Amino acid sequence: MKKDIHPKYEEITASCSCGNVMKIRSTVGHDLNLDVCSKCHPFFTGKQRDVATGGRVDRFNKRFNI
Amino acid sequence: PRSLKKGPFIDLHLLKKVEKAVESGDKKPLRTWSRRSTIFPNMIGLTIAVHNGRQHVPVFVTDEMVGHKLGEFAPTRTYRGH
Amino acid sequence: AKLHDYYKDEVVKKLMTEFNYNSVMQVPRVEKITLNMGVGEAIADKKLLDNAAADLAAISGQKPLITKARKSVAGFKIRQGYPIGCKVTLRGERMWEFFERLITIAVPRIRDFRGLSAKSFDGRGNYSMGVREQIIFPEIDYDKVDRVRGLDITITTTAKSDEEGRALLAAFDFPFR
Amino acid sequence: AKQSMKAREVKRVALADKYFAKRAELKAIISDVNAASDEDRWNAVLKLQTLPRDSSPSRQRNRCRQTGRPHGFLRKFGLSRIKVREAAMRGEIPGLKKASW
Amino acid sequence: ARIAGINIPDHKHAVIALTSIYGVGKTRSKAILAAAGIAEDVKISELSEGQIDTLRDEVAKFVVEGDLRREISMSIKRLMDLGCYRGLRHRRGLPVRGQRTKTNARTRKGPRKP
RNA sequence: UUCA
RNA sequence: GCCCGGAUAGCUCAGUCGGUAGAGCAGGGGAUUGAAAAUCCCCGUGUCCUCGGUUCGAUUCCGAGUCCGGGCACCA
RNA sequence: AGGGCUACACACGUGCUACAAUGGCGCAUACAAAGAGAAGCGACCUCGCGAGAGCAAGCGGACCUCAUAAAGUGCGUCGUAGUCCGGAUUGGAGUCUGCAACUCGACUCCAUGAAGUCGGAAUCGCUAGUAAUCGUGGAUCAGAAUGCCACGGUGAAUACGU
Ligand SMILES: [Mg+2]
Ligand SMILES: [Mg+2]
Ligand SMILES: [Mg+2]
Ligand SMILES: [Mg+2]
Ligand SMILES: [Mg+2]
Ligand SMILES: [Zn+2]
């Protein structure tokens, strides 16, 4: 790489919705709390069902006519 | 919004159709009519063709499109501006 | 990138034994990944390019190369030698790091994702697709940005066949719809 | 006078008052602390939504009796303003007459 | 004065100068002042930095300036991401809460430029 | 000042 | 080649010794009339031909030009 | 059966709230009328900021219900300021009723709470309890109008003249 022409290139952790540590050597520069990793994300698995959040379906099943 | 004591509401035709959907495949959407229906868990993942008054236009159900009603994504008037 | 060593052991451990090869060199491999935004409408707004290429600088790690048009046409009003598009070629551990980031923290974050195509190939294993909800990458703040421009991204492989392309993609499991 | 709408009205009203007191004990299930809040008042709304819409105490129109005029109805006489004034000026209506004060 | 990063006025009775927060109207104002436990119409100038600290740890219970900023941000972006009737009214600059448009609704409408 |  | 004159809004034009854009026309909306005219109320409308230096500050002072007009001009 | 009649670069006519110190809000307390009501009115009583939920008498009635009239007055606070003025605008959390409140309701709760600093040419109404304001109710009403109709409290200005 040419020196002093590219964005910062620090290494960052896969700060997912559950915190599965899958480090990323990226440009974001911060441990961006994302959703997308083995823990807490869909297509990190088949037959997707996000386990339990505040989200929508959680409070919907909380009211639900319970 | 709906009275909480009454809980949600949804018409049984769409209810049972989307039950069959979550059961045995969903490659096809649902050609419902009941725009007012509460989005349930077992509708997520589909691309339901919700009625706009003349057409049953598709809308994919997302985990955020759960606390809503079906018609909310089928606009009813073709707006173009002046 | 861990994905490169994942390759170095597992992907050969799969492909050598599947396609019953007679060399590790004979094993198909990925060499470069070129990302591109062929903006085209930036003919009017000069600043849209700097607006556009900023995503390559963000999504990819390298300050992009802005590509200049090749022929002044009549159909799109463009003049030859004009800042029409932008690209980033990612190879080495840069390629592997970006591909890890992609397939892990951005690809599954695609909304309404029935999956990728199983046919996007030139006929010579060099895969090529294109995303449109680019903010799926956590590299975009998507709140101070201007537009939601997509791109088209190609993965050049040494696989001289589309079957070998499918195999080398499913190596890293490549949703494939 | 488009008698079809008057017949609509009488049909809806007759059906509603025949199914009377059924939707009553269906809807009462929905406002009370019983039903486990998940089963009985839940199947009650299904029962209701299956029930005829043409048989509710609200889907009717409350049209007149003379010629079923849509607007201007008056529950006190079941007539439009027009025909109640006609009956008044005819003397049909007991106690009715132009008043001032 | 400095609480929540904002600079609420001085010589302005606390029960009203508390409301200077983008995220605290009169309701949260009275509630926070009661939960902290100070007299009503005292001017903010007569309130010590320790009183500011009590009010700080108390407003640390309610939503605050930047919290409400990002909250309204995320809510409207949620409506957008859904792309519903409400989200489209938002994005196209029209009334949202179900009103008439043809003549009134000038706030959602804009000025009379053309 | 005009209508017509 | 000499002296003079000018360009200003969407058209007709003002004024400059620097403190700063006007009016008519115009268009659009409105008011009045039974209806429109005129009228009236409003709004719109300027990078002052162009570029450049001068002074706390320019259409205005200057330089350097773009045109257009007038008058006078060398006999390669 | 859904949809729209509730669309919206835009003009115009009504009416409501404002742009506030005779005024903003808190406390205290009082002075009216006109009604309406039987799947209706709903007492009292507990809870929920609160919509209301529950309980659910009496009332086809000079008897129970809507029932605080408000504007008022006393005390207080605000202190001439996009204000402690507004309250539209949105976000979220509900209540109601309706088979059903997304398009397309009223109400309640939380927070930003906006143009708005008395309005141009012009133009409307009003001669007395009249306008000006303040609140009240009824019909239409499954719900749902600032609308319509009706009610009652304060309560003036100027008429020289054609
Ligand atoms: Mg280099
Ligand atoms: Mg409509
Ligand atoms: Mg206020
Ligand atoms: Mg008179
Ligand atoms: Mg009316
Ligand atoms: Zn996780």
Side-chain angles (χ1 to χ4, degrees), chain B residues 21-65:
Chain B
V22 79
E23 163 176 328
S24 197
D26 45 19
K27 185 50 168 63
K28 263 67 172 179
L30 285 159
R31 214 172 58 89
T32 182
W33 266 256
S34 85
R35 304 178 70 255
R36 52 202 205 224
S37 307
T38 46
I39 308 180
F40 274 165
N42 82 317
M43 202 205 317
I44 312 166
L46 287 91
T47 175
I48 299 314
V50 55
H51 200 173
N52 76 334
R54 70 168 183 261
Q55 300 284 161
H56 304 272
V57 307
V59 52
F60 210 68
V61 188
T62 293
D63 181 80
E64 191 79 284
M65 331 186 197

Short mmCIF file of all heavy atoms in Angstrom, two decimals, chain B residues 21-65:
data_model
loop_
_atom_site.label_atom_id
_atom_site.label_comp_id
_atom_site.label_asym_id
_atom_site.label_seq_id
_atom_site.Cartn_x
_atom_site.Cartn_y
_atom_site.Cartn_z
N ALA B 21 -48.94 -22.08 5.65
CA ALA B 21 -47.70 -21.59 5.07
C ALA B 21 -46.50 -22.01 5.91
O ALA B 21 -45.57 -22.66 5.42
CB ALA B 21 -47.75 -20.07 4.94
N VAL B 22 -46.50 -21.64 7.19
CA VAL B 22 -45.41 -22.02 8.08
C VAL B 22 -45.31 -23.53 8.19
O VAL B 22 -44.28 -24.06 8.62
CB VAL B 22 -45.59 -21.38 9.47
CG1 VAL B 22 -46.61 -22.14 10.29
CG2 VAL B 22 -44.26 -21.30 10.19
N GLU B 23 -46.37 -24.26 7.80
CA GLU B 23 -46.31 -25.71 7.82
C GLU B 23 -45.56 -26.27 6.61
O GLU B 23 -44.50 -26.90 6.76
CB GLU B 23 -47.72 -26.30 7.88
CG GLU B 23 -47.77 -27.77 7.50
CD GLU B 23 -49.15 -28.37 7.64
OE1 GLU B 23 -49.90 -27.92 8.53
OE2 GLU B 23 -49.48 -29.29 6.86
N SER B 24 -46.08 -26.05 5.41
CA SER B 24 -45.70 -26.85 4.24
C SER B 24 -45.20 -25.97 3.11
O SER B 24 -45.68 -26.04 1.98
CB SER B 24 -46.87 -27.70 3.76
OG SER B 24 -46.42 -28.74 2.92
N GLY B 25 -44.23 -25.13 3.39
CA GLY B 25 -43.63 -24.40 2.30
C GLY B 25 -44.30 -23.05 2.10
O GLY B 25 -45.49 -22.86 2.38
N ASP B 26 -43.52 -22.09 1.61
CA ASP B 26 -44.01 -20.73 1.48
C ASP B 26 -43.51 -20.03 0.22
O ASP B 26 -43.61 -18.80 0.15
CB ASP B 26 -43.62 -19.92 2.71
CG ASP B 26 -42.17 -20.13 3.11
OD1 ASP B 26 -41.38 -20.61 2.27
OD2 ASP B 26 -41.82 -19.84 4.28
N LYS B 27 -42.98 -20.76 -0.76
CA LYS B 27 -42.45 -20.12 -1.96
C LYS B 27 -43.45 -19.16 -2.59
O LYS B 27 -43.05 -18.20 -3.25
CB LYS B 27 -42.02 -21.18 -2.97
CG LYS B 27 -41.34 -20.64 -4.23
CD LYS B 27 -40.21 -19.69 -3.88
CE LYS B 27 -39.35 -19.37 -5.08
NZ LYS B 27 -40.11 -18.69 -6.16
N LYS B 28 -44.74 -19.38 -2.38
CA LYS B 28 -45.73 -18.45 -2.88
C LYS B 28 -46.20 -17.52 -1.76
O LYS B 28 -46.24 -17.91 -0.59
CB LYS B 28 -46.94 -19.18 -3.47
CG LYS B 28 -46.89 -19.34 -4.97
CD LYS B 28 -45.76 -20.27 -5.39
CE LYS B 28 -45.83 -20.58 -6.88
NZ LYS B 28 -44.72 -21.47 -7.32
N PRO B 29 -46.56 -16.28 -2.09
CA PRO B 29 -47.12 -15.38 -1.08
C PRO B 29 -48.55 -15.76 -0.74
O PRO B 29 -49.05 -16.81 -1.17
CB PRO B 29 -47.06 -14.01 -1.75
CG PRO B 29 -46.22 -14.19 -2.99
CD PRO B 29 -46.39 -15.61 -3.39
N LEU B 30 -49.21 -14.92 0.05
CA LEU B 30 -50.63 -15.09 0.33
C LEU B 30 -51.42 -13.98 -0.35
O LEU B 30 -51.03 -12.81 -0.29
CB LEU B 30 -50.91 -15.08 1.84
CG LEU B 30 -50.50 -16.35 2.58
CD1 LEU B 30 -50.33 -16.08 4.07
CD2 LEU B 30 -51.47 -17.48 2.34
N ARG B 31 -52.50 -14.37 -1.01
CA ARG B 31 -53.40 -13.40 -1.64
C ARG B 31 -54.55 -13.04 -0.71
O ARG B 31 -55.71 -13.33 -0.97
CB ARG B 31 -53.91 -13.95 -2.96
CG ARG B 31 -54.13 -12.88 -4.01
CD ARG B 31 -54.45 -13.54 -5.32
NE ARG B 31 -55.63 -14.38 -5.18
CZ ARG B 31 -56.87 -13.95 -5.36
NH1 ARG B 31 -57.08 -12.69 -5.72
NH2 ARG B 31 -57.89 -14.78 -5.20
N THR B 32 -54.21 -12.42 0.42
CA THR B 32 -55.21 -12.05 1.41
C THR B 32 -56.03 -10.86 0.94
O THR B 32 -55.86 -10.33 -0.16
CB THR B 32 -54.54 -11.71 2.73
OG1 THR B 32 -55.55 -11.39 3.69
CG2 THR B 32 -53.62 -10.53 2.56
N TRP B 33 -56.94 -10.44 1.81
CA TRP B 33 -57.72 -9.22 1.64
C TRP B 33 -57.67 -8.40 2.91
O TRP B 33 -57.70 -7.17 2.87
CB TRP B 33 -59.17 -9.56 1.28
CG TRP B 33 -59.49 -9.60 -0.18
CD1 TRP B 33 -60.16 -8.66 -0.90
CD2 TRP B 33 -59.17 -10.65 -1.11
NE1 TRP B 33 -60.28 -9.05 -2.21
CE2 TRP B 33 -59.68 -10.26 -2.37
CE3 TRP B 33 -58.50 -11.87 -1.00
CZ2 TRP B 33 -59.53 -11.05 -3.50
CZ3 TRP B 33 -58.37 -12.65 -2.13
CH2 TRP B 33 -58.88 -12.24 -3.36
N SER B 34 -57.57 -9.08 4.05
CA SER B 34 -57.73 -8.45 5.36
C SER B 34 -56.53 -7.57 5.71
O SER B 34 -55.62 -8.02 6.41
CB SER B 34 -57.95 -9.51 6.44
OG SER B 34 -56.72 -10.01 6.90
N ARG B 35 -56.55 -6.33 5.24
CA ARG B 35 -55.40 -5.45 5.41
C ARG B 35 -55.14 -5.13 6.88
O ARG B 35 -53.99 -4.85 7.26
CB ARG B 35 -55.64 -4.15 4.64
CG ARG B 35 -55.92 -4.34 3.17
CD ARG B 35 -56.19 -3.00 2.50
NE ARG B 35 -54.99 -2.18 2.43
CZ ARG B 35 -54.75 -1.13 3.20
NH1 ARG B 35 -55.62 -0.77 4.13
NH2 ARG B 35 -53.63 -0.44 3.06
N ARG B 36 -56.17 -5.15 7.71
CA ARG B 36 -56.08 -4.71 9.10
C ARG B 36 -55.44 -5.73 10.02
O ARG B 36 -55.29 -5.45 11.21
CB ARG B 36 -57.49 -4.37 9.61
CG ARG B 36 -58.50 -5.50 9.39
CD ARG B 36 -59.93 -4.99 9.40
NE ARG B 36 -60.86 -6.05 9.76
CZ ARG B 36 -62.02 -6.28 9.15
NH1 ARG B 36 -62.39 -5.52 8.13
NH2 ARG B 36 -62.80 -7.28 9.55
N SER B 37 -55.06 -6.90 9.51
CA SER B 37 -54.68 -8.01 10.36
C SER B 37 -53.35 -7.75 11.05
O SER B 37 -52.45 -7.15 10.48
CB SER B 37 -54.60 -9.29 9.54
OG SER B 37 -55.79 -9.50 8.81
N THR B 38 -53.25 -8.21 12.30
CA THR B 38 -52.02 -8.06 13.06
C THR B 38 -50.98 -9.05 12.56
O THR B 38 -51.27 -10.23 12.38
CB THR B 38 -52.28 -8.28 14.55
OG1 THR B 38 -53.09 -9.44 14.73
CG2 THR B 38 -52.98 -7.09 15.15
N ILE B 39 -49.77 -8.55 12.31
CA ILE B 39 -48.69 -9.41 11.84
C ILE B 39 -48.24 -10.32 12.97
O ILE B 39 -47.88 -9.85 14.06
CB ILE B 39 -47.53 -8.59 11.29
CG1 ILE B 39 -48.04 -7.57 10.26
CG2 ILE B 39 -46.50 -9.50 10.66
CD1 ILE B 39 -46.97 -6.70 9.67
N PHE B 40 -48.25 -11.62 12.73
CA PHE B 40 -47.92 -12.63 13.72
C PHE B 40 -46.52 -13.18 13.49
O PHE B 40 -45.87 -12.90 12.48
CB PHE B 40 -48.97 -13.74 13.68
CG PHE B 40 -50.16 -13.47 14.53
CD1 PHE B 40 -51.32 -14.21 14.38
CD2 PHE B 40 -50.12 -12.49 15.51
CE1 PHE B 40 -52.41 -13.97 15.19
CE2 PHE B 40 -51.21 -12.25 16.31
CZ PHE B 40 -52.36 -12.98 16.15
N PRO B 41 -46.01 -13.97 14.44
CA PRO B 41 -44.70 -14.62 14.21
C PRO B 41 -44.69 -15.51 12.99
O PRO B 41 -43.78 -15.40 12.16
CB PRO B 41 -44.48 -15.42 15.50
CG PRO B 41 -45.32 -14.75 16.53
CD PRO B 41 -46.51 -14.20 15.81
N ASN B 42 -45.69 -16.37 12.84
CA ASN B 42 -45.69 -17.36 11.76
C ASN B 42 -45.91 -16.76 10.40
O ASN B 42 -46.07 -17.53 9.45
CB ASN B 42 -46.74 -18.43 12.03
CG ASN B 42 -48.13 -18.01 11.62
OD1 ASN B 42 -48.55 -16.87 11.86
ND2 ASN B 42 -48.86 -18.92 10.99
N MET B 43 -45.94 -15.44 10.23
CA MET B 43 -45.93 -14.84 8.91
C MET B 43 -44.55 -14.35 8.49
O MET B 43 -44.33 -14.12 7.30
CB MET B 43 -46.92 -13.67 8.85
CG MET B 43 -47.38 -13.32 7.44
SD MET B 43 -47.93 -11.62 7.26
CE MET B 43 -48.90 -11.42 8.76
N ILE B 44 -43.62 -14.20 9.43
CA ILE B 44 -42.28 -13.73 9.09
C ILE B 44 -41.66 -14.69 8.09
O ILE B 44 -41.87 -15.91 8.15
CB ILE B 44 -41.41 -13.60 10.35
CG1 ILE B 44 -42.16 -12.85 11.44
CG2 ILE B 44 -40.14 -12.85 10.03
CD1 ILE B 44 -41.52 -12.97 12.80
N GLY B 45 -40.89 -14.14 7.15
CA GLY B 45 -40.22 -14.92 6.14
C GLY B 45 -40.94 -15.00 4.82
O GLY B 45 -40.33 -15.39 3.82
N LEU B 46 -42.22 -14.64 4.77
CA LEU B 46 -43.00 -14.70 3.54
C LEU B 46 -43.01 -13.35 2.83
O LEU B 46 -42.44 -12.37 3.30
CB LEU B 46 -44.43 -15.16 3.84
CG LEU B 46 -44.64 -16.63 4.20
CD1 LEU B 46 -44.56 -16.85 5.70
CD2 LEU B 46 -45.96 -17.13 3.64
N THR B 47 -43.66 -13.33 1.67
CA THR B 47 -43.68 -12.16 0.79
C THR B 47 -45.10 -11.77 0.42
O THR B 47 -45.42 -11.55 -0.75
CB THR B 47 -42.85 -12.44 -0.47
OG1 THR B 47 -42.98 -11.35 -1.39
CG2 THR B 47 -43.28 -13.74 -1.13
N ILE B 48 -45.94 -11.60 1.45
CA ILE B 48 -47.39 -11.68 1.29
C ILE B 48 -47.90 -10.64 0.30
O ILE B 48 -47.49 -9.48 0.33
CB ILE B 48 -48.08 -11.53 2.65
CG1 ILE B 48 -47.63 -12.65 3.58
CG2 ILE B 48 -49.59 -11.54 2.50
CD1 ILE B 48 -47.65 -14.00 2.91
N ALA B 49 -48.80 -11.07 -0.59
CA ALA B 49 -49.46 -10.19 -1.54
C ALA B 49 -50.70 -9.60 -0.87
O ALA B 49 -51.77 -10.21 -0.87
CB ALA B 49 -49.82 -10.94 -2.82
N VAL B 50 -50.55 -8.41 -0.32
CA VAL B 50 -51.60 -7.74 0.44
C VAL B 50 -52.40 -6.85 -0.50
O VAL B 50 -51.84 -6.21 -1.40
CB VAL B 50 -50.99 -6.95 1.61
CG1 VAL B 50 -49.93 -5.98 1.11
CG2 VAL B 50 -52.08 -6.22 2.39
N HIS B 51 -53.71 -6.82 -0.30
CA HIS B 51 -54.59 -6.07 -1.19
C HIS B 51 -54.46 -4.57 -0.96
O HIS B 51 -54.38 -4.09 0.17
CB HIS B 51 -56.04 -6.50 -0.99
CG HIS B 51 -56.93 -6.17 -2.14
ND1 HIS B 51 -58.24 -6.59 -2.22
CD2 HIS B 51 -56.70 -5.46 -3.27
CE1 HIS B 51 -58.78 -6.16 -3.34
NE2 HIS B 51 -57.86 -5.47 -4.00
N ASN B 52 -54.45 -3.82 -2.06
CA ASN B 52 -54.42 -2.37 -2.02
C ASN B 52 -55.77 -1.74 -2.33
O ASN B 52 -55.87 -0.52 -2.42
CB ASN B 52 -53.37 -1.84 -3.01
CG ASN B 52 -53.85 -1.92 -4.45
OD1 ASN B 52 -54.69 -2.74 -4.79
ND2 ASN B 52 -53.31 -1.05 -5.29
N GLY B 53 -56.81 -2.56 -2.51
CA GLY B 53 -58.09 -2.11 -3.01
C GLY B 53 -58.37 -2.57 -4.42
O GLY B 53 -59.54 -2.78 -4.78
N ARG B 54 -57.34 -2.73 -5.23
CA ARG B 54 -57.47 -3.33 -6.55
C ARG B 54 -56.47 -4.45 -6.79
O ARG B 54 -56.82 -5.44 -7.44
CB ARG B 54 -57.32 -2.26 -7.64
CG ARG B 54 -55.94 -1.66 -7.82
CD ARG B 54 -55.91 -0.85 -9.10
NE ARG B 54 -54.59 -0.30 -9.39
CZ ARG B 54 -54.23 0.95 -9.11
NH1 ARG B 54 -55.09 1.78 -8.54
NH2 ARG B 54 -53.01 1.37 -9.40
N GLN B 55 -55.26 -4.34 -6.26
CA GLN B 55 -54.20 -5.31 -6.48
C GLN B 55 -53.78 -5.93 -5.15
O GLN B 55 -53.95 -5.34 -4.09
CB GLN B 55 -52.97 -4.67 -7.14
CG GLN B 55 -53.23 -4.06 -8.49
CD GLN B 55 -53.36 -5.09 -9.57
OE1 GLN B 55 -53.90 -4.82 -10.64
NE2 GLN B 55 -52.87 -6.29 -9.30
N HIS B 56 -53.22 -7.13 -5.24
CA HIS B 56 -52.58 -7.80 -4.11
C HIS B 56 -51.07 -7.71 -4.35
O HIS B 56 -50.47 -8.60 -4.95
CB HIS B 56 -53.07 -9.24 -3.97
CG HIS B 56 -54.56 -9.35 -3.85
ND1 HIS B 56 -55.21 -9.30 -2.64
CD2 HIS B 56 -55.52 -9.51 -4.79
CE1 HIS B 56 -56.51 -9.42 -2.83
NE2 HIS B 56 -56.72 -9.55 -4.13
N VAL B 57 -50.47 -6.63 -3.86
CA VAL B 57 -49.07 -6.32 -4.13
C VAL B 57 -48.18 -6.97 -3.07
O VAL B 57 -48.57 -7.07 -1.90
CB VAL B 57 -48.85 -4.80 -4.18
CG1 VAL B 57 -49.81 -4.17 -5.17
CG2 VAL B 57 -49.01 -4.18 -2.81
N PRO B 58 -47.00 -7.44 -3.44
CA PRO B 58 -46.15 -8.15 -2.48
C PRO B 58 -45.51 -7.22 -1.45
O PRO B 58 -45.23 -6.05 -1.71
CB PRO B 58 -45.07 -8.79 -3.37
CG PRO B 58 -45.65 -8.79 -4.74
CD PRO B 58 -46.48 -7.56 -4.81
N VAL B 59 -45.28 -7.78 -0.27
CA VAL B 59 -44.44 -7.17 0.75
C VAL B 59 -43.83 -8.28 1.60
O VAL B 59 -44.53 -9.15 2.11
CB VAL B 59 -45.21 -6.16 1.61
CG1 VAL B 59 -46.48 -6.79 2.18
CG2 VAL B 59 -44.32 -5.68 2.73
N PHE B 60 -42.51 -8.25 1.73
CA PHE B 60 -41.80 -9.26 2.51
C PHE B 60 -41.95 -8.94 3.99
O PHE B 60 -41.78 -7.79 4.40
CB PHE B 60 -40.33 -9.30 2.11
CG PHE B 60 -39.69 -10.64 2.27
CD1 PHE B 60 -40.07 -11.70 1.47
CD2 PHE B 60 -38.70 -10.84 3.22
CE1 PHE B 60 -39.48 -12.94 1.61
CE2 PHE B 60 -38.11 -12.07 3.37
CZ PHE B 60 -38.50 -13.12 2.56
N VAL B 61 -42.26 -9.95 4.79
CA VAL B 61 -42.42 -9.76 6.23
C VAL B 61 -41.05 -9.79 6.89
O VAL B 61 -40.28 -10.73 6.70
CB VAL B 61 -43.34 -10.82 6.82
CG1 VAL B 61 -43.64 -10.49 8.27
CG2 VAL B 61 -44.62 -10.91 6.02
N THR B 62 -40.75 -8.75 7.66
CA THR B 62 -39.48 -8.61 8.35
C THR B 62 -39.76 -8.54 9.85
O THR B 62 -40.87 -8.20 10.27
CB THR B 62 -38.73 -7.35 7.86
OG1 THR B 62 -38.34 -7.54 6.50
CG2 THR B 62 -37.48 -7.07 8.68
N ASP B 63 -38.75 -8.90 10.65
CA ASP B 63 -38.91 -8.89 12.10
C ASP B 63 -39.32 -7.52 12.62
O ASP B 63 -39.80 -7.41 13.75
CB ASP B 63 -37.61 -9.35 12.76
CG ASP B 63 -37.70 -9.37 14.26
OD1 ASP B 63 -38.25 -10.35 14.81
OD2 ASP B 63 -37.22 -8.41 14.90
N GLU B 64 -39.13 -6.46 11.82
CA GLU B 64 -39.65 -5.15 12.20
C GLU B 64 -41.09 -4.95 11.75
O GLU B 64 -41.84 -4.22 12.40
CB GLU B 64 -38.77 -4.05 11.63
CG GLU B 64 -39.06 -2.65 12.17
CD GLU B 64 -38.46 -2.40 13.54
OE1 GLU B 64 -39.02 -2.91 14.53
OE2 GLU B 64 -37.44 -1.70 13.62
N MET B 65 -41.49 -5.60 10.66
CA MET B 65 -42.89 -5.62 10.23
C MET B 65 -43.63 -6.74 10.94
O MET B 65 -44.08 -7.72 10.34
CB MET B 65 -42.98 -5.78 8.71
CG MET B 65 -41.81 -5.22 7.94
SD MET B 65 -42.09 -5.29 6.17
CE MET B 65 -40.42 -5.06 5.55
#
